[PDB]
């Protein structure tokens with residue numbers, strides 16, 4: 280895709296901090312950029328839609344390649360069209376703005392380059408306010424193995440790049456992306472938004488997926504860490520027919536404290552009381568305590584009112600601990616009767632390989648047209664006994680979360696992420 284000219288692209292500023300030790304942090308002047316898929320795509324020569332509603336305009340987009348040469352991703356009015364505002368070290372995502380629903384943003388090193396995080400033997404921490412996120416919404420902060428330049432050096436027809444939020448991929452191998460690898464997704468485009476023949480896969484570390492009711496932390500490995508194209512139902516993921524047909528783990532190894540049997544830990548009025556802000560800390564430990572080692576454990580702490588509170592232990596029979604490890608992941612898949620696609624695609628060793636490639640920080644607010652976010656905050660397989668281990672993930676009713684409901688009833692929902700800090704283990708807090 281080309282770079283557009285109707286609207287100029289100005290990235291909202293966002294500061295964060297890199298630390299070397301507790302109390303010793305340096306502020307970085309970052310910025311964020313809106314993902315390519317939320318943008319208006321217009322023809323390079325005038326101001327005409329290449330994409331109209333849920334369909335490609337064949338005059339400009341008769342095939343994948345031509346479309347990409349003829350069409351441009353426009354700049355974004357962040358506040359007014361997409362409901363994104365930044366202040367200093369804080370970023371606010373509004374749910375519904377006019378006819379826009381939600382957003383996905385990446386953190387930039389500079390105006391053409393995603394910030395790369397190498398997470399092994401490091402810790403990542405951020406403050407969050409999810410008090411205005413009801414059932415059916417997902418305020419996500421996570422990492423994917425995208426190219427720093429958004430694909431430009433690999434794909435000559437991508438002239439927009441990171442500056443326009445190109446190059447997305449995650450463990451679902453999404454086929455709803457209008458542009459992949461410097462080509463439009465037009466041949467095979469089946470309207471619902473819509474899905475095409477091509478998808479974009481890469482390893483995904485979901486540090487935080489949450490609303491005011493439930494949260495989960497979930498690594499999702501892929502055979503190839505790092506961005507790959509797939510095609511048809513071989514993609515697997517949410518949009519393909521068979522979830523488990525592809526090269527990535529679509530479920531992942533998850534720790535949601537509610538699902539693990541502690542229902543008094545996280546929620547309104549609870550130990551982590553989601554009516555107020557709190558701090559989320561995630562450590563990525565290696566077997567030998569060094570930066571070159573194998574990923575072996577993911578640990579979680581929360582901080583609310585200067586109190587440091589560790590992730591609760593699993594209270595599921597035969598599943599032990601409060602951290603993600605190979606042992607935990609094996610035991611939890613068995614005790615819930617879920618297919619162990621995690622270990623099939625290389626588990627934590629392969630999550631670690633992706634972390635070694637470097638990963639991009641994504642911040643997001645979305646609702647779920649496929650599954651109503653019930654996998655996160657309700658009884659998920661809905662046709663199943665909510666007393667059997669692993670079905671119940673939160674207190675939301677099973678009729679919650681349908682997009683046309685939440686978009687109409689809670690349009691002023693929002694999420695705020697702030698005070699991002701990154702460094703060696705135990706440097707981001709006391």
Ligand SMILES: *[C@@H]1O[C@H](CO)[C@@H](O[C@@H]2O[C@H](CO)[C@@H](O)[C@H](O)[C@H]2NC(C)=O)[C@H](O)[C@H]1NC(C)=O
Nearest residue numbers: 536540541542543544550588589590591592594
């Ligand atoms: C849910 O998790 C909480 C937090 O871990 C548990 O409360 C802790 O219990 C331990 C004993 O196992 C105490 O030493 C801590 O001081 C407790 N923390 C707080 C702040 O309460 C709680 O027991 C768990 N509840 C259930 C339902 O199992």
Ligand SMILES: *[C@@H]1O[C@H](CO)[C@@H](O)[C@H](O)[C@H]1NC(C)=O
Nearest residue numbers: 562568587703704705706709
């Ligand atoms: C981090 O601090 C914790 C105690 O809060 C301790 O278990 C651990 O050894 C520390 N890690 C390092 C490498 O300093």
